[PDB]
RNA sequence: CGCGGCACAUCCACCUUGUGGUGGGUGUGGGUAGGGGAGCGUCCCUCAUUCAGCGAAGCCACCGGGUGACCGGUGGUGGA
RNA sequence: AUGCCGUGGUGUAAAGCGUGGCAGUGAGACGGCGGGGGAUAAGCUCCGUACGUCGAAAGGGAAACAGCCCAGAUCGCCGGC
RNA sequence: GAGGAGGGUGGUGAUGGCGUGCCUUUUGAAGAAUGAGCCUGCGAGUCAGGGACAUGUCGCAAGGUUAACCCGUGUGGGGUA
């Protein structure tokens, strides 16, 4: 079986032993999560509904914060002398999902 | 009563005295709401103002 | 090329017209409707003055109105 | 203390004319960008001593 | 004058609104 | 105090030219050939960070017009029917049901179906 | 993670289509998708997914009236003058499998892999195919109902 | 619009309530000429401290770091 | 009709004014509307316009296309409208 | 780890989309306007003055401060014109 979870504002195709990426969620490591779903199939049936959804939610387990990767940003316009330098990391957070 | 105006084009291209008559109504960006009371000088800035918001009676 | 500046001249505008509106508070001495000639009239608590002026002698609110077809400008005290 | 483009020992003549060589225009051989020419904006002797008042 | 016409013309099109750049 | 400038210099001259590494020509080897071209490399990686949100987009609904479409269904009435139903699933996970279970996306089918108004084209 | 299909997952099948009374727009339409596998839910642009089309009866292709006479056929050949024109009703009596053919060719996107997915097209003049060692299934046209 | 990071301004509450720090709202952050504010890097002197013939400077390669100029780690070459 | 000056309500943080420090600019272009010069010719020229955009503005559309239409990029996302 | 499958560094990149170098100067240039064959090195808002104006800070405060010069190995102490 698997299921369609909604976590930071996007969503995420799990099954029961994944490793997903998602946004940062204030959690320490070791902590179980809680994660609203949007469709749920367990063989041939599909569920479906929203009525029926909200009583079905992932359980998750945080593995850790980690960082993405480094983007380098120079922006430039022709004939100018524009120049802007910027860089960044997105903070991540590793969940397993022993739930559904 | 209490009219609900609703931006729905932007300013851009727009004249001073229709910038300037968003500004007094409380509006910012496309699709941002506001509630105002329905006394005469609401309906005079929405006159000015109509091409580029969408007003409705709502509570 | 036909040299046709045969007239190519102007003179300065000078700022005429009315300076004070109606409803308006002013000074004594404030210059309401500078013009050429009596094209406005002076009526109760306005003098005309050397170059037809029309400034006040008293401070107050000013009003325009008729006085038998030539127009005047007056001062409420 | 260094020299600037007027106390380096020569250059005072130009070293070839200024129009139909090809080359750009130098007008001395001692001006600031040459190797061997003179320092712009360089050091020159100087006194640092303060005026700080009695008191303090 | 095929161009200067031709370039002139295409100003009748829905997305321009009935003006261009010269 | 005389600075030769050659150990600030470098320091800008071996960052440029590792991450020229690949280039062809004159723009991996030569530093002003080289910082021309990390110019534009940057700024389209920034105009394109952007641009594959909308180009996943684009080949997610080719993949959803392509599965309804096997199953007498535009993708027209196929967005349709799964708001009309409450079913709000991302273009992202939709065709990934469509490529890895077929049979799950068949009854997301008869659910945007079913819900659908039954004509279609008169008004509401 | 997208899916993005690898090398050997793309199977290929082998469709024929008749063209009794079919217009050369339907056709060139159906069988430009029918190539590329925009009909199918692993498409990819940068991949050669897609069958097989074996075009038969291309003589009988439905061209209007006002089309055999006044719609013209160019080729350049480099030459000065080298212009020259022939019209489609003078096409559709020598070579009509070349007509068909055409209007595929410019429905595919103008790159490098649409050289490689129009070596999966026959065209042929006649109701008779030389490729019944494998086993063509018939396509009919169909519109999906809205 | 949603979720997460940063900066500036303003307002409301705390801490030696302006030298200003911590927390919470709303707003704002395209930019040439130019104005303002805050920083990285090379060198030299002085004060304190700490490495170096058990291998300093410099150079080369690799793996990592910071919002930027840029930085650190390990190894190879090298000789104050 | 608009515009303009005055005044009484209401609305809106980054509007106005005085005085100092430091500037840059003083070659503009096209589009809509009102006009002069020109043959009511010009991608022509000279003015008006709390008119717009470019200049100094990326992104989407007009095949391509400083000046036209939509919209103003703080950064990330393989999320929606 | 003998090999294969799984996962991850590093190197290459078949193929798809998007995409008009840099500087100067201009109303506007990828421009068929200027400048540069390449690399390493050098190469441009500095200094003098009890100057001038305006500020940030420190000492003294109805007063503030000395210049020349004198005396000390010094950066210290005198010196009221
Ligand atoms: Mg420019
Ligand atoms: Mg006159
Ligand atoms: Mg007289
Ligand atoms: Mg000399
Ligand atoms: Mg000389
Ligand atoms: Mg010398
Ligand atoms: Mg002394
Ligand atoms: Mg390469
Ligand atoms: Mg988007
Ligand atoms: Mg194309
Ligand atoms: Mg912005
Ligand atoms: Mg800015
Ligand atoms: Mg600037
Ligand atoms: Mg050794
Ligand atoms: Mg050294
Ligand atoms: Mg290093
Ligand atoms: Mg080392
Ligand atoms: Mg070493
Ligand atoms: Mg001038
Ligand atoms: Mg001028
Ligand atoms: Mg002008
Ligand atoms: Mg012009
Ligand atoms: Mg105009
Ligand atoms: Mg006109
Ligand atoms: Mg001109
Ligand atoms: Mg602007
Ligand atoms: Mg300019
Ligand atoms: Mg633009
Ligand atoms: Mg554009
Ligand atoms: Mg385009
Ligand atoms: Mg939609
Ligand atoms: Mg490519
Ligand atoms: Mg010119
Ligand atoms: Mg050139
Ligand atoms: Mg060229
Ligand atoms: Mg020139
Ligand atoms: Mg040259
Ligand atoms: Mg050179
Ligand atoms: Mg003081």
Same mark, same amino acid.
């Given at each position: *079986? ?35 779903? $949007?469709?749920?199939?367990?063989? $041939?049936?599909? *569920?479906?509904? $929203? ?5 079905? $939610? ?6 850790? &914060? ?16 524009? &120049?802007?330098?910027?860089? &960044? ?8 999902? *022993?739930?559904? | ?59 | ?36 000639? /009596?094209? =406005? ?11 037809? /002026?029309?400034?006040?002698? /008293?401070?107050?609110?000013?009003? =325009? ?6 127009? /005047? ?5 | ?56 | ?22 | 105090?005389? !600075? ?29 050939? %080289? ?26 609904? %080719?993949?959803? #017009? %392509?599965?309804?479409?096997? #199953? ?36 997301? !089918?008869? !659910? ?7 004509? !279609?084209?008169?008004?509401? | ?22 217009? @050369?727009?339907?056709?060139? +339409?159906?069988?430009?998708?029918? @190539? ?36 013209? +056929? ?8 080298? @212009? ?23 429905? @595919? ?38």
């Amino acid at each position: *079986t698997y299921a369609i979870v909604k976590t930071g504002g996007k969503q995420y195709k799990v099954a029961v032993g994944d490793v997903v990426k998602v946004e940062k969620l204030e959690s320490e490591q070791g902590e179980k999560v809680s994660l609203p779903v $949007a469709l749920v199939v367990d063989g $041939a049936t599909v *569920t479906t509904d $929203a009525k029926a959804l909200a009583k079905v $939610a992932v359980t998750g387990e945080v593995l850790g &914060h980690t960082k993405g990767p480094k983007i380098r940003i120079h922006k430039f316009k022709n004939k100018t002398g524009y &120049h802007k330098r910027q860089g &960044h990391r997105q903070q991540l957070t590793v969940l397993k999902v *022993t739930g559904i | 009563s209490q009219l609900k105006i609703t931006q729905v084009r932007s300013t851009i291209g727009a004249r001073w005295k229709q910038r300037e008559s968003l500004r007094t109504l409380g509006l910012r960006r496309i699709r941002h709401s506001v509630i105002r009371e329905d006394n005469a000088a609401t309906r005079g800035l929405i006159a000015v103002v109509r091409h580029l918001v969408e007003v409705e009676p709502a509570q | 090329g036909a040299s046709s500046s045969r007239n190519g001249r102007d003179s300065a505008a000078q700022r005429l017209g009315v300076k004070r509106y109606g409803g308006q508070v002013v000074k004594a001495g404030e210059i309401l409707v500078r013009q050429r000639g /009596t094209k =406005f009239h002076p009526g109760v608590n306005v003098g005309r003055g050397g170059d037809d /002026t029309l400034f006040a002698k /008293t401070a107050g609110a000013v009003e =325009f109105g008729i006085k038998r077809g030539r127009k /005047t400008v007056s001062i409420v005290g | 203390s260094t020299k600037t483009r007027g106390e380096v020992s020569g250059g005072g003549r130009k070293p070839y004319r200024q129009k139909g060589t090809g080359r750009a225009r130098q007008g001395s051989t001692r001006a600031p960008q040459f190797t061997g020419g003179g320092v712009v904006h360089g050091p020159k002797p100087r006194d640092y001593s303060q005026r700080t008042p009695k008191k303090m | 004058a095929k161009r200067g016409r031709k370039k002139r013309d295409r100003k009748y099109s829905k997305a321009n609104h009935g003006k261009r750049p010269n | 105090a005389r !600075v030769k400038r050659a150990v600030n210099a470098h320091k800008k001259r071996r960052s440029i030219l590792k991450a020229s590494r690949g280039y062809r020509g004159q723009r991996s080897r030569l530093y002003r050939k %080289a910082k021309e071209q990390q110019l534009h490399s940057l700024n389209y990686a920034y105009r394109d960070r952007r641009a594959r949100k909308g180009e996943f987009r684009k080949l997610w609904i %080719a993949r959803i #017009n %392509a599965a309804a479409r096997l #199953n007498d269904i535009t993708y027209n009435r196929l967005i349709q029917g799964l708001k009309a139903a409450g079913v709000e699933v991302d273009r992202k996970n939709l065709a990934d049901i469509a490529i890895s279970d077929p049979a799950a996306f068949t009854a997301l !089918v008869d !659910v945007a179906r079913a819900a659908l108004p039954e004509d !279609v084209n008169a008004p509401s | 993670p997208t899916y993005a299909p690898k090398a050997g997952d793309t199977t290929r099948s082998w469709y024929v289509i008749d063209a009794t009374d079919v217009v @050369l727009g339907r056709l060139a +339409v159906a069988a430009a998708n029918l @190539l590329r596998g925009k009909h199918k839910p692993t498409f990819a642009p940068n991949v050669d997914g897609g069958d097989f089309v074996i075009v038969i009866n291309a003589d009988k292709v439905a061209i209007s009236g006002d089309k055999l006479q006044h719609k013209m +056929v160019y080729r350049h050949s480099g030459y000065p003058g080298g @212009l020259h024109k022939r019209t489609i009703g003078e096409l559709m009596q020598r070579h009509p499998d070349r007509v068909v053919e055409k209007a595929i060719l410019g429905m @595919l996107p103008k790159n490098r892999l649409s050289r490689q997915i129009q070596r999966k097209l026959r065209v042929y003049a006649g109701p008779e195919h030389p490729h019944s060692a494998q086993q063509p299934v018939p396509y009919e046209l169909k519109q999906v109902a809205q």
